[PDB]
Amino acid sequence: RKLHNEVLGILGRVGEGNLPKMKEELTNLPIRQSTDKEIQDVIQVIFNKSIQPEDSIFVPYYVKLVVSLINDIGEGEPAGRFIRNAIIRQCQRTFENAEEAQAQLEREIANLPEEEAEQRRLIFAGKQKANINFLGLLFTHGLVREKVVLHVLEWLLYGTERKRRFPADYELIHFMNLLLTCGKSFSKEGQEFVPKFRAVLEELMHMHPQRRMQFLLLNTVETIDNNWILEHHHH
């Protein structure tokens, strides 16, 4: 496909210096005159390149191209509405896969030796961090629903079967990195996403947390608040 390769090209050459040239190269593509399959493919391509562990650095640029694309084609346009529903569907697929991959791992290493289960958990974490990073970047750029973030954190902290008292070790690390991304910011976008992430953590608090779980969520919201009052200091 012609439109497929052109998007790949843009994602390749995108960096800090040429992001405005890349945004205008993307708007210059005939997306409004493209089929449902062609548009769905563009979103699928960006979402796959974004969950590759090698790209962690360029992922904010991929996500900034998607913001650019929906800022060009508005929700009052047929293609604008379609792109938005394709992002919803592709978020669902990406984080549903991430959830099931976690569930599969735990079933696969349940009867495995202790030292083997641990090494398999480390191998998985390296792949899972790419998803969690992507979730954070989509959230800070307003591309993923607050509800998706909440559902991921539910299985990430309470387990895939939701029966955990406290999160597993590699799960806690994915959360701290998510916390660093979504829990703090001085940017004009930060003004809205930092209270949104705090709200998500307040919801998990009304999901019957135990002693360590309540201390985790309360101390996190407290640190978010401390850092918030600090970033909103004047004169």
Per residue, the 3-state secondary structure of 212-225, as one string, reads HHHHHHHHHHHHHH
Count CB atoms within 10 A of the CB of residue 133: 21
Q: Which method, experimentally, gave rise to this model? A: X-ray
Full residue range of the structural domain in which residue 170 is found: 1-235
CA–CA gap between residue 151 and residue 159 (Å, rounded): 11
In whole angstroms, what is the distance from residue 182 CA to residue 129 CA? 15
How many helices (H) and strands (E) in the chain?
Answer: 10, 0
Q: CA 152, CA 159: separation in Å to the nearest integer?
A: 10
Resolution value, angstrom units? 2.4
Q: How many domains, the chain?
A: 1
Rounded Cα gap, residues 228 and 201, in angstroms: 15
234 burial class (0-12, 13-18, 19+ CB within 10 angstroms)?
A: exposed
Residues 19 and 9: their CA atoms lie apart, in Å, by: 13
Angstrom distance (rounded) from CA 213 to CA 219: 10
Residue pair 19/64 in contact by the 8 Å Cβ criterion: yes
What is the distance between the alpha carbons of residues 235 and 227, in angstroms, rounded to a whole number? 17
Query: Tokens at residue 212, please?
Result: 């360590």
Half-sphere exposure of 48 (CA within 13 A, CB side): 9
41 in Cβ contact with 1 (< 8 Å): yes
